[PDB]
Design a protein around this ligand. Structure first.
Ligand code: SF4
Ligand SMILES: [O-]
Length: 753
């Protein structure tokens, strides 16, 4: 047996491709059919491969992940729940990355110094709880969670879970990396099996090769346009075909990253020589050599069956730019100017923003610098404001060293700290006023309303970093880098040629400053202090167990119209200040959702006072008076970012059930984890039978069972009653979470008490 360590920081934790192989072989003896690559890695990690029921789309798999990664906006509540479990140490390699609480304002070093003073209490809490429980800690300034994972922790065949919806990024290195809520990370840190509904597999066969201005980002901008934001739900997207070898390993991670915007469980590429190359240049040639010996297990079987196949010819793909509003409104760059003109979207670009974990590779930075040096060679600078977010300290130190950062400063860019910043709305943006209509273009991934600056009228478009750079120099959406001319300082018209740049540094990567803090797994006599008067951190009081009774005469808090993402439910931005304080963050509950009654945000009728007011204030009034309530939603409810606060906050303010036409995956799991009932209409037209004034009784909880629907009695004010049926996806493990009041309550019953 080979003894190759999982990373440079865990020299004693070895990669177990021997167990992966053994489990794949138990499973293919049972199934007698070819396995896709995602099937090999996922079934290769089952807790019990001989007995597990495997039906794509139907069974819940009990899995053993190799490691857990958390970022600091979700690590605080995952760790406060681990502290209530009472367990002494994490069971698997786990890390915390401090990337979400650094606000962009002054640029780089100045913003990091300010964040360290402002967020002291929280960074402290996380560093101490990390030292105490055996969790590795990447300090503020070190980089964004997915770039640090790609550079240090992802490898072919890993099963990794992360408390962030863009965890799929690590699929660019052939692993299965899945986004989860904080309570799912607590299961694995605690050592119990992790459950995942068996995925469907969408295959995307790539043919030809990219060339010119077309980059890896255009592949997933095209795929998002084809599948739409609800097309990937419950499936893994598995890229394959001869065109795969023409994409860099970091380009593969860009594509897997943005698969989060079509609702996919994750995305994955097969192990090939581009990944081998990246592993060797990031100090992990021993891992590339071991994966070469287990190569058969890290590619799909011949003839495996995909549930949907899409074919993309890379040689015909053109540059794309998606938005405004939703990531699946796809346009060629060649025609977004004309469409904008037509639709009334501002053509003048105020800000061009590149980088973040989706698009800060060395190759991305080099291609953007290659565009920028052509503008500089004609005496031009950006017309738009222009920001650059490096995804890690290693990338910042290396592009600084190889000269790209200076080219990007000379065209007018400001380099921001190695942190999410504008990508999750941590941006002190003052060039526009709130409600001023304007257009920004980014090389990020989500461009939903208010995501980047909390201004509903900002039209955000997502594209590749080299296209953001060319459009920031032109200053307008009415500019096509492939066809159009700019006028230099000197009066000559010139055309931008297609950027060419190296994939990886010729020299090695410069790691930059010391940013990792290993746990004393010696010492650990750390005491975690949470002040009882902190406004930022609060220990959890357990939720009530189920009373054994049906839910009668539930009040509707709000019937939501249309789209309701986790940012409508639990907004980010300034509310990130309270991600470790459940009572204070609950003051944002559902403030962005549209009430069907009046089509306004944050204005619902209080049933007792008959005043219209804020949703959190109304939910606290109902709670205070003993009125149990419900939310009614439309399709794909809870779409988006993974924040379990979206499920914790309604449980905390007295909600009992959320009834919708359908749920996004991570949010439905988070609702079940927190003791709420996520239920869907057995007939979606019944959404129209429920009016805001109706009261509901959910009956049948005594006989709650997998596959059996619950009965809902709609009680109309005129005395009419209508019965409808509601489906649920609970298996009996999950019904036990409901009966105990939460999954954490259940686990504590199992820990002998
Ligand atoms: S907020 Fe943006 S930069 Fe931060 S982890 Fe998510 S995708 Fe990456
Ligand atoms: O994310």
């Amino acid at each position: 047996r080979a003894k190759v360590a999982m990373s440079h920081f865990e020299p004693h934790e070895y990669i177990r491709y021997d167990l992966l192989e053994k489990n794949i072989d138990i499973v293919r003896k049972r199934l007698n059919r070819p396995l896709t690559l995602s099937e090999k890695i996922v079934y290769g990690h089952l807790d019990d491969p001989a007995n597990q029921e495997i039906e794509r789309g139907k069974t819940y798999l009990r899995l053993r992940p190799d490691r857990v990664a958390m970022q600091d906006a979700t690590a605080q509540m995952a760790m406060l729940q681990f502290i209530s479990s009472g367990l002494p140490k994490v069971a698997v390699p786990s890390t915390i990355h401090c990337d979400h609480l650094i606000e962009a304002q002054l640029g780089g070093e100045k913003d990091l110094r300010r964040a360290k003073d402002i967020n002291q209490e929280v960074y402290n809490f996380l560093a101490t709880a990390g030292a105490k429980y055996g969790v590795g800690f990447w300090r503020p300034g070190s980089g964004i969670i997915h770039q640090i994972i790609l550079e240090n922790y992802a490898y072919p065949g890993v099963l990794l879970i992360g408390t962030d919806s863009h965890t799929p990024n690590g699929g660019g290195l052939g692993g299965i990396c899945i986004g989860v809520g904080g309570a799912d990370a607590v299961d694995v840190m605690a050592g119990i099996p992790w459950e995942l509904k068996c995925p469907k597999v969408i295959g995307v066969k790539l043919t030809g090769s990219l060339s010119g201005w077309t980059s890896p980002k255009d592949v997933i901008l095209k795929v998002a346009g084809i599948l739409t934001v609800k097309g990937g739900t419950g499936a893994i997207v598995e890229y394959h075909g001869p065109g795969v070898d023409s994409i860099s390993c970091t380009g593969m991670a860009t594509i897997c990253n943005m698969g989060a915007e079509i609702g996919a469980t994750t995305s994955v590429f097969p192990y090939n020589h581009r990944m081998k190359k990246y592993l060797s240049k990031t100090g992990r040639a021993d891992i590339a050599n071991l994966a070469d010996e287990f190569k058969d297990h890290l590619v799909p079987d011949s003839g495996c069956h995909y549930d949907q196949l899409i074919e993309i010819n890379l040689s015909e793909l053109k540059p794309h730019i998606n938005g405004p509003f939703t990531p699946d409104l796809a346009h060629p760059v060649a025609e977004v100017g004309s469409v904008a003109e037509k639709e009334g979207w501002p053509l003048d670009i105020r800000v061009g923003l590149i980088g973040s974990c989706t698009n800060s590779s060395y190759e991305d930075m080099g291609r953007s610098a290659a565009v920028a040096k052509q503008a500089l060679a004609h005496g031009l600078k950006c017309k738009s404001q222009f920001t650059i977010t490096p995804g890690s300290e290693q990338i910042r130190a290396t592009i600084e060293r190889d000269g790209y950062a200076q080219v990007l400063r000379d065209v007018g860019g400001i380099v921001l700290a190695n942190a999410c910043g504008p990508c999750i709305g941590q941006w002190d943006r003052k060039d526009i006023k709130k409600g001023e209509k304007n257009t920004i273009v980014t090389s990020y991934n989500r461009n939903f309303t208010g995501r980047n600056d909390a201004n509903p009228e900002t039209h955000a478009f997502v594209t590749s970093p080299e296209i953001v750079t060319a459009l920031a120099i032109a200053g307008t959406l009415k500019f096509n880098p492939e066809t159009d001319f700019l006028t230099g300082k000197d009066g000559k018209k010139f055309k931008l040629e297609a950027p060419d740049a190296d994939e990886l540094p010729r020299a090695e990567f410069d790691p930059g400053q010391d940013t990792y803090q290993h746990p004393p797994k010696d010492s650990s006599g750390q005491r975690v202090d949470v002040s009882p008067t902190s406004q930022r951190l609060q220990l959890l009081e357990p939720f009530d167990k189920w009373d054994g009774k049906d839910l009668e005469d539930l009040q509707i808090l709000i019937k939501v119209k249309g789209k309701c993402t986790t940012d409508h439910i639990s907004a980010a931005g300034p509310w990130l200040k309270f991600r470790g304080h459940l009572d204070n963050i609950s003051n944002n509950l559902l403030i962005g959702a549209i009430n069907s009654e009046n089509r306004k945000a944050n204005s619902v009728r209080n049933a007792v006072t008959q005043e219209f007011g804020p949703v959190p204030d109304t939910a606290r009034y109902y709670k205070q008076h003993g009125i149990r309530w419900v939310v009614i939603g439309d399709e794909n409810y809870g779409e988006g970012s993974s924040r379990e606060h979206s499920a914790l906050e309604p449980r905390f303010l007295g909600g009992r059930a959320i009834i919708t036409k359908s749920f996004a995956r991570i949010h439905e799991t988070n609702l079940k984890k927190q003791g709420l009932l996520p239920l869907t209409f057995a007939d979606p037209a019944d959404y129209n039978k429920i009016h805001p004034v109706d009261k509901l009784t959910i009956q049948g909880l005594k006989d709650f069972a997998p596959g059996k629907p619950l009965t809902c009695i709609i009680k109309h004010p005129n005395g009419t009653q209508e019965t409808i049926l509601l489906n649920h996806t609970f298996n009996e493990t999950q019904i036990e979470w409901f009966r105990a009041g939460s999954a954490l309550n259940r686990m504590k019953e199992l820990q002998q008490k």
